[PDB]
């Protein structure tokens, strides 16, 4: 028969980054903790299974002597191991992991299916960590044509598509274009926008466009699609001036908070106008003791932002609440094209818009000895500084290893270190990082 | 006939790092500057032509689909271009570059051969930047046997040696062992010392030994050589218990200040007991206005230390002398085995010896998601901190990209940032650097 409602100190909904971190921390401290996750293919969350880890594992594998099928299998081995490592690490702290989709019956009661019965759970603290789901554009035929995939489906194709279309121009789409180009596909990116990489420094965007085109990718702007349909197994993308034909189509046009399954109408929890779970500076909803962390609260969609939401909630629950969303320091980013394009802080354009007293300096990797050592002259560094306060406003690092190097910048920005320090730092040599000695001699 | 003595504001002896930097800086500012360099194969100095740049260029090339001869030619292309880039950048500032070996006639007069005549030059400031030369052990037969090379000769072998011996166990020897092993040689390292990598953390040295042996290198300790001789073209290294046979032998047992050619007996300039040019905190000799920078002053032998000696001398000549050798901050190092082994600050053993209130933490790369993404689980991170002051005392980063990552640590050590900051920094993901969030949760 059915069980009586189970009471925990904390319930986490979703095996996301903030949630699994908070759950294990409090279970290790002796609290009674439950974590509810709808899919065994998602133990450890989006980054482990469908996001950060498989995407970058596929790109590393594609540079090696492996067939398409071997690259896919390598990705499955790596994500499968981390999936099991995450389940077992969380359960090993004492967290009770439930395999079900949770929905709310009231502010702090959830229901799950548990075999032939429903089971209810409650707690004093509920942390909603349900992530996001792919946007699907309302283009007629997109959702019903064969060989059309989102960013998850594209990771499990049966064979290499000879021609791959990508609809959208963000980090995700461009990383997959780079991947499939390496694997051997003829790749065309179709973007509605006029400007390629409009958030990047223009000089850096121009280099990126050059390198992607050199590598054989076709980058199209101002593309307005009226319909998607099939011709046999192939996909036709019908646009104003041309119909494009592909063996597979990826769409990558954003992801939105995953809130529908929760049945929030059964609670007092408020959504934002855009559909995210609304939170205050402590990631708390308007219901006391109910929080929302990671992508579902509408914040920046990176695993490291979900991790920092754990720091905010843990500060409020276990500490004195002194670290809040209003205190968050600098947030870098990387897009793993070839080479990686990394950035932190303000661009020149952003500093100009704020009327700050700024200066910039740019050095191409082609002028750097380590670029010659590497046999790879792609990329550039660009720094943006405030000539009055001596603060570093931002930097772009587009180069081999930039996903590591960018974090050098963040240490100095977070700690209010003047930009002139980088002219004095003693760097290892030969490296790309030592060129920061020259980039900051402004 | 002969020319009258030429007068400059500054004479630099040797195309080293500090010297070429100072020469171009002051010539660009309108001073009259001469730089005297004995070998056109050395324009740009040791790192460009025989040191940092060819060694690391050979290691990158050896990972690619290139024959031995193609790897050597690639190295020659890269160093040749940087040699010409350095000559032309320095001459383009207005420096007069003389192709000769300089020696002193008195404290601030040098003589060079200039065609069929001698030429004298003088200045108010002389900067001696003559670098170092390879040590050659007094082993009978070492200096007279065929197929025995120092670190320069080993970069120009006629063909791959099937078996390569390396005598000595520093960064230089081990990097060349790694290189020739990749290229296909059977490599044996013969070290007199009992302990492998005695300056590294022991756990890190043990991993390095494991990986080098996995890769096929033989690492021998406590080897005392009594003679080197030839058998035909092969080299025999006669040691107490065994005679080793190789197709070529590298010796790499250190480099010493290159002072003999200068004829310093014709000046008042003092040497240290070990034979370096003695300097004060401003890199100044006991003769006012004569300085010694880089390896020749006995300091740490890295290009980035020679660069920092430029900062010291420039502070004294052009500024207020407020930055001195006594003010130098933290100096990292990398040894480019596979993967690179980087370090900065104190080891655990060094902190223990100083009786500091320290704690340590170590995380293997095998426990880090990016190691799995990379398909490379080699290496580890180790942090050493002061639990009272919260300062970072030191770190070891042995991993892919560690030569970039180590510089993250230096920013925090130089700026007195507490180690707990690294638990809060928002790093890019997936990367090896983000694991600093966990390494510093001590
Ligand atoms: C293709 C791609 C590439 C990316 N690349 C990077 C990158 O390089 N770097 C980076 O930092 N970020 C990257 N991201 C973003 C990053 O993956 C996400 O921002 C982050 O993982 C989201 O974490 P989260 O904590 O919000 O929750 P998630 O990790 O999304 O977890 C939510 C969990 O909730 C579960 N769930 C949902 N609803 C319910 C319910 N009602 N009941 C039970 N379980 C439920 C889901 O099954 C899921 O496991 C990438 C994302 C994608 C898709
Ligand atoms: C194999 C090897 C690998 C190395 N790897 C690295 C590394 O990865 N990273 C690192 O930072 N360091 C490394 N080093 C060390 C680094 O190369 C040296 O520490 C640094 O380059 C020395 O610079 P310097 O300014 O002292 O002068 P140098 O660059 O040594 O220049 C001295 C110049 O003086 C000239 N000269 C000498 N006497 C006279 C004279 N009487 N008249 C005229 N000219 C003269 C020489 O021809 C030479 O060009 C390496 C060294 C070697 C040999």
Tab-separated table of N, CA, C and O in Angstrom, chain A residues 6-57:
chain	number	residue	atom	x	y	z
A	6	UNK	N	7.261	11.354	3.710
A	6	UNK	CA	8.608	11.341	4.224
A	6	UNK	C	9.025	12.775	4.508
A	6	UNK	O	8.739	13.675	3.719
A	7	UNK	N	9.685	12.980	5.647
A	7	UNK	CA	10.129	14.302	6.032
A	7	UNK	C	11.664	14.326	6.011
A	7	UNK	O	12.361	13.455	6.574
A	8	UNK	N	12.177	15.378	5.371
A	8	UNK	CA	13.617	15.601	5.267
A	8	UNK	C	13.887	17.001	5.808
A	8	UNK	O	12.979	17.835	5.960
A	9	UNK	N	15.184	17.277	6.061
A	9	UNK	CA	15.571	18.650	6.361
A	9	UNK	C	15.632	19.492	5.090
A	9	UNK	O	15.210	20.661	5.051
A	10	UNK	N	16.129	18.902	3.999
A	10	UNK	CA	16.291	19.546	2.692
A	10	UNK	C	15.812	18.592	1.603
A	10	UNK	O	16.184	17.408	1.642
A	11	UNK	N	15.033	19.097	0.647
A	11	UNK	CA	14.755	18.398	-0.599
A	11	UNK	C	15.342	19.241	-1.715
A	11	UNK	O	15.041	20.416	-1.855
A	12	UNK	N	16.186	18.635	-2.567
A	12	UNK	CA	16.654	19.229	-3.834
A	12	UNK	C	15.878	18.571	-4.961
A	12	UNK	O	15.822	17.332	-5.073
A	13	UNK	N	15.273	19.394	-5.848
A	13	UNK	CA	14.590	18.909	-7.036
A	13	UNK	C	15.509	19.130	-8.232
A	13	UNK	O	15.692	20.267	-8.647
A	14	UNK	N	16.028	18.001	-8.780
A	14	UNK	CA	16.908	18.074	-9.952
A	14	UNK	C	18.368	17.860	-9.529
A	14	UNK	O	18.835	18.500	-8.594
A	15	UNK	N	19.060	16.987	-10.315
A	15	UNK	CA	20.471	16.679	-10.001
A	15	UNK	C	21.391	17.705	-10.667
A	15	UNK	O	22.326	17.332	-11.383
A	16	UNK	N	21.151	19.016	-10.428
A	16	UNK	CA	21.961	20.062	-11.057
A	16	UNK	C	23.209	20.336	-10.214
A	16	UNK	O	23.485	19.665	-9.208
A	17	UNK	N	23.963	21.387	-10.593
A	17	UNK	CA	25.271	21.636	-10.008
A	17	UNK	C	25.081	22.180	-8.587
A	17	UNK	O	25.607	21.621	-7.640
A	18	UNK	N	24.361	23.322	-8.458
A	18	UNK	CA	24.120	23.824	-7.119
A	18	UNK	C	23.449	22.788	-6.216
A	18	UNK	O	23.861	22.692	-5.048
A	19	UNK	N	22.487	22.059	-6.785
A	19	UNK	CA	21.730	21.147	-5.953
A	19	UNK	C	22.543	19.965	-5.432
A	19	UNK	O	22.445	19.618	-4.258
A	20	UNK	N	23.313	19.328	-6.312
A	20	UNK	CA	24.109	18.187	-5.847
A	20	UNK	C	25.205	18.640	-4.878
A	20	UNK	O	25.525	17.919	-3.934
A	21	UNK	N	25.704	19.894	-5.060
A	21	UNK	CA	26.738	20.378	-4.165
A	21	UNK	C	26.150	20.629	-2.765
A	21	UNK	O	26.716	20.225	-1.768
A	22	UNK	N	24.974	21.322	-2.751
A	22	UNK	CA	24.325	21.611	-1.454
A	22	UNK	C	23.904	20.307	-0.783
A	22	UNK	O	24.055	20.151	0.418
A	23	UNK	N	23.301	19.374	-1.566
A	23	UNK	CA	22.806	18.144	-0.958
A	23	UNK	C	23.931	17.376	-0.262
A	23	UNK	O	23.759	16.915	0.866
A	24	UNK	N	25.038	17.190	-1.005
A	24	UNK	CA	26.123	16.427	-0.373
A	24	UNK	C	26.747	17.168	0.806
A	24	UNK	O	27.098	16.524	1.804
A	25	UNK	N	26.841	18.503	0.718
A	25	UNK	CA	27.446	19.238	1.824
A	25	UNK	C	26.594	19.071	3.079
A	25	UNK	O	27.121	18.781	4.176
A	26	UNK	N	25.260	19.190	2.951
A	26	UNK	CA	24.485	19.126	4.179
A	26	UNK	C	24.324	17.684	4.656
A	26	UNK	O	24.238	17.446	5.857
A	27	UNK	N	24.242	16.698	3.742
A	27	UNK	CA	24.158	15.327	4.215
A	27	UNK	C	25.451	14.944	4.947
A	27	UNK	O	25.380	14.259	5.974
A	28	UNK	N	26.602	15.397	4.450
A	28	UNK	CA	27.870	15.088	5.130
A	28	UNK	C	27.911	15.710	6.525
A	28	UNK	O	28.591	15.182	7.426
A	29	UNK	N	27.207	16.821	6.697
A	29	UNK	CA	27.144	17.488	7.984
A	29	UNK	C	26.103	16.870	8.891
A	29	UNK	O	25.974	17.343	10.012
A	30	UNK	N	25.385	15.834	8.460
A	30	UNK	CA	24.456	15.119	9.316
A	30	UNK	C	22.982	15.483	9.082
A	30	UNK	O	22.150	14.918	9.797
A	31	UNK	N	22.671	16.352	8.112
A	31	UNK	CA	21.249	16.655	7.839
A	31	UNK	C	20.642	15.492	7.056
A	31	UNK	O	21.340	14.742	6.347
A	32	UNK	N	19.309	15.388	7.080
A	32	UNK	CA	18.584	14.375	6.322
A	32	UNK	C	18.159	15.010	4.993
A	32	UNK	O	17.446	16.013	4.968
A	33	UNK	N	18.665	14.446	3.864
A	33	UNK	CA	18.551	15.152	2.580
A	33	UNK	C	18.006	14.202	1.540
A	33	UNK	O	18.460	13.039	1.441
A	34	UNK	N	17.086	14.703	0.713
A	34	UNK	CA	16.605	13.998	-0.450
A	34	UNK	C	16.924	14.777	-1.704
A	34	UNK	O	16.954	16.020	-1.687
A	35	UNK	N	17.257	14.061	-2.780
A	35	UNK	CA	17.451	14.670	-4.105
A	35	UNK	C	16.606	13.865	-5.083
A	35	UNK	O	16.711	12.634	-5.128
A	36	UNK	N	15.732	14.572	-5.838
A	36	UNK	CA	14.808	13.911	-6.735
A	36	UNK	C	15.221	14.216	-8.183
A	36	UNK	O	15.394	15.387	-8.530
A	37	UNK	N	15.464	13.166	-8.971
A	37	UNK	CA	15.944	13.350	-10.352
A	37	UNK	C	15.117	12.474	-11.294
A	37	UNK	O	14.974	11.248	-11.054
A	38	UNK	N	14.572	13.110	-12.342
A	38	UNK	CA	13.644	12.429	-13.257
A	38	UNK	C	14.274	11.411	-14.214
A	38	UNK	O	13.516	10.582	-14.746
A	39	UNK	N	15.588	11.519	-14.491
A	39	UNK	CA	16.178	10.675	-15.532
A	39	UNK	C	17.535	10.125	-15.098
A	39	UNK	O	18.421	10.862	-14.677
A	40	UNK	N	17.674	8.790	-15.198
A	40	UNK	CA	18.953	8.192	-14.829
A	40	UNK	C	20.038	8.598	-15.828
A	40	UNK	O	21.215	8.633	-15.428
A	41	UNK	N	19.659	9.041	-17.013
A	41	UNK	CA	20.607	9.570	-18.000
A	41	UNK	C	21.087	10.950	-17.609
A	41	UNK	O	22.042	11.451	-18.215
A	42	UNK	N	20.569	11.485	-16.507
A	42	UNK	CA	20.926	12.838	-16.067
A	42	UNK	C	21.502	12.875	-14.659
A	42	UNK	O	21.664	13.963	-14.069
A	43	UNK	N	21.959	11.741	-14.143
A	43	UNK	CA	22.630	11.836	-12.855
A	43	UNK	C	23.919	12.646	-12.964
A	43	UNK	O	24.723	12.415	-13.874
A	44	UNK	N	24.043	13.708	-12.150
A	44	UNK	CA	25.134	14.676	-12.266
A	44	UNK	C	24.746	15.923	-13.048
A	44	UNK	O	25.516	16.907	-12.931
A	45	UNK	N	23.604	15.884	-13.732
A	45	UNK	CA	23.042	17.113	-14.312
A	45	UNK	C	23.402	17.293	-15.786
A	45	UNK	O	23.963	16.435	-16.493
A	46	UNK	N	23.018	18.467	-16.303
A	46	UNK	CA	23.193	18.804	-17.709
A	46	UNK	C	24.674	18.877	-18.102
A	46	UNK	O	25.015	18.304	-19.151
A	47	UNK	N	25.515	19.517	-17.316
A	47	UNK	CA	26.894	19.644	-17.780
A	47	UNK	C	27.484	18.222	-17.963
A	47	UNK	O	28.103	17.974	-19.024
A	48	UNK	N	27.300	17.336	-16.957
A	48	UNK	CA	27.903	15.994	-17.043
A	48	UNK	C	27.410	15.251	-18.270
A	48	UNK	O	28.219	14.566	-18.929
A	49	UNK	N	26.080	15.243	-18.570
A	49	UNK	CA	25.523	14.266	-19.482
A	49	UNK	C	25.253	14.781	-20.895
A	49	UNK	O	25.349	13.986	-21.825
A	50	UNK	N	24.888	16.071	-21.030
A	50	UNK	CA	24.434	16.586	-22.325
A	50	UNK	C	25.069	17.943	-22.669
A	50	UNK	O	24.774	18.448	-23.758
A	51	UNK	N	25.889	18.491	-21.790
A	51	UNK	CA	26.338	19.875	-21.923
A	51	UNK	C	27.872	19.953	-22.038
A	51	UNK	O	28.432	19.414	-23.016
A	52	UNK	N	28.501	20.610	-21.047
A	52	UNK	CA	29.945	20.954	-20.975
A	52	UNK	C	30.810	19.724	-21.270
A	52	UNK	O	31.802	19.798	-22.012
A	53	UNK	N	30.524	18.636	-20.567
A	53	UNK	CA	31.460	17.493	-20.597
A	53	UNK	C	31.353	16.758	-21.929
A	53	UNK	O	32.395	16.565	-22.602
A	54	UNK	N	30.201	16.318	-22.469
A	54	UNK	CA	30.216	15.629	-23.750
A	54	UNK	C	30.669	16.538	-24.898
A	54	UNK	O	31.392	16.054	-25.794
A	55	UNK	N	30.268	17.821	-24.884
A	55	UNK	CA	30.650	18.672	-26.003
A	55	UNK	C	32.177	18.743	-26.113
A	55	UNK	O	32.713	18.484	-27.228
A	56	UNK	N	32.860	19.025	-24.977
A	56	UNK	CA	34.315	19.249	-25.028
A	56	UNK	C	34.988	17.888	-25.211
A	56	UNK	O	36.071	17.811	-25.855
A	57	UNK	N	34.420	16.777	-24.683
A	57	UNK	CA	35.043	15.461	-24.891
A	57	UNK	C	35.013	15.092	-26.377
A	57	UNK	O	35.983	14.545	-26.951
